[PDB]
Amino acid sequence: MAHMERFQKVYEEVQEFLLGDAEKRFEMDVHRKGYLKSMMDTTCLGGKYNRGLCVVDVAEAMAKDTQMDAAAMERVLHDACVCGWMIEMLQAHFLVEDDIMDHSKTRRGKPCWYLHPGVTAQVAINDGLILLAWATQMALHYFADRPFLAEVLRVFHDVDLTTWIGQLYDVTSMVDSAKLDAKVAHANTTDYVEYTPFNHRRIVVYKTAYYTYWLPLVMGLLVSGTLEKVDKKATHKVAMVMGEYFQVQDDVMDCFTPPEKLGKIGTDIEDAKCSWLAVTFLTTAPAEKVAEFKANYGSTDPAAVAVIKQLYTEQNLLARFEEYEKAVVAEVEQLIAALEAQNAAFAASVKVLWSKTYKRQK
């Protein structure tokens, strides 16, 4: 990737600043610094870097479009790499906490952070919070004399909130919303009434699309000072369309992609999740198959999990995804053409992002 080399160099720079800053400010000892170095390395690395690299892709596109000289371009790209590492650290925080919440086994081909024996969910909750804090630390340090600092913090913290609200919708999706009460313990759904297209879209837009698609594009525009050059409404719309699709892919892959290729072991079936597969099944399958699904979903019994996957296969859900994917492309292309008519440089950076997304395998 055009910016991978720079991006990794900035990771080591940022890691040195953050660890050294903790030493200076908090009387950090060598052992806990070493712990935090390895924590950062394990939680922030080993992914695709789609979000972080997007920021740099956009910023370079926009920096070229506005003809910045050598010194201005060097700054924009370094600032873009820092913003990209903010998002990757936000992501690290999201997955550390999510892996605890989902009680998962593997992340990026390694044990989940909390499942490292010298960590535990207790310490991992804390570690995830330090990761979130470091993201803001980077902006506060590197962007201290940038007029865009305020705008960066504003969009970052809006998206952070958006994501946890999406997580709220996700964790409570197998509970009949009317039964949702802090004071009263309640069973998980047996009727699946709220497993609707609307409810799935609500979950995936807020939990995924804002931080995976909207945030990187906006940060890229912010650090290059070109946010005013683009149609903000069209940008938001293509970010929502692509992000929803990205999460639909993730949902499909939970069931149909071997965990070793994916790097993680999804338990959407065991955990009765309102996934794209479950919702599309429940709204398109015949009555008896809907009934058999309800008797088998949300169970840790391998035999029950096998029935769900056979039911999904029978209902041709992979073919239904292919047709959904076809519609997404038509919609993405139209939105990108609208963007291109206004700023071809930005539209091209949206094409890069879409290219990394469309028909991805992990």
Ligand X SMILES: CC(C)CCOP(=O)(O)OP(=O)(O)O
List residues binding a second copy (CB under 8 A): 22, 25-29, 31-32, 34-36, 38-39, 42, 97, 100-101, 103, 113, 116-119, 122-123, 125-127, 129-130, 133-134, 136-137, 140, 149-150, 153-154, 157-158, 160-162, 164-169, 171-172, 177-178, 180-186, 202, 206
Under a CB-based contact definition with an 8 Å cutoff, are residues 77 and 143 in contact?
no
Binder of Ca ion out of 57, 60, 88, 102 (CB under 5 A)? 102
Cα 243 to the center of its chain, rounded Å: 9
Q: What six digits make up the tokens of 261?
A: 């290729």
Query: Site for ligand 476 (CB under 6 A): which residue of 98, 158, 325, 331?
Result: 98
Write the DSSP string, 18-61: HHHHHHHHH---HHHHHHHHHHHHHHHSSS--HHHHHHHHHHHH
Task: Rank residues 20 and 46 by Cβ distance to ligand X and give the closer one.
Answer: 46
253-266 CB burial, b ≥16 within 10 A, e <16:
bbbebeeeebbbeb
For a second copy, give the closer residue by CB, 31 or 359.
31
Specify the residue, 63 or 253, whose C-beta has the smaller distance to ligand 476: 253
191 is an annotated ligand-binding site residue: no
- Residue 296 binds to ligand X (criterion: CB under 6 A): no
Residues paired with residue 107 on neighbouring β-strands, in sequence order: 110
The encoded tokens of residue 90 equal 């936000």
Q: Which is nearer to ligand X, 76 or 248 (CB)?
A: 248
Closest residue by Cα to residue 351 from 335, 51, 359, 323: 335
Cβ 248 vs Cβ 352: under 8 Å: no
Residue type at 301?
A: D
Which of ligand X, Ca ion, a second copy, none has residue 116 at its interface (CB below 5 to 8 Å by kind)? a second copy
Alpha-carbon distance values, 33 to 12, 28, 45, 96, 309 (Å):
14, 6, 18, 19, 45
Q: At what angle do helices 344-357 and 50-65 cross, to 10 degrees?
A: 160
Measured from the CB of residue 71, what is the shortest distance to ligand 476 in angstroms? 38
The dihedral built from the CA positions of residue 142, 147, 149 and 152, taken in this order, carries a sign that is negative
Applying CB under 6 A, the span of 20-28, 47-55, 309-317, 338-346 interacting with ligand X comes to 47-55
Based on its alpha-carbon atoms, the radius of gyration of the chain, rounded to whole angstroms, reads 21
**Least distance (Å) from ligand X to the CB of residue 96?**
12
The one of Ca ion, ligand X, a second copy, none whose footprint includes residue 303, by CB under 5 to 8 A per kind, is: none
Q: Site residues (CB under 6 A) for ligand X?
A: 47-48, 50, 91, 108, 208, 212, 250
Point out the annotated binding site: 98, 102, 170, 250-251
Which residues of the shown chain bind ligand 476 in the complex (CB under 6 A)?
94, 97-98, 102, 163, 167, 207-208, 250, 264, 266
Binding residues for Ca(2+): 98, 102, 170, 250-251
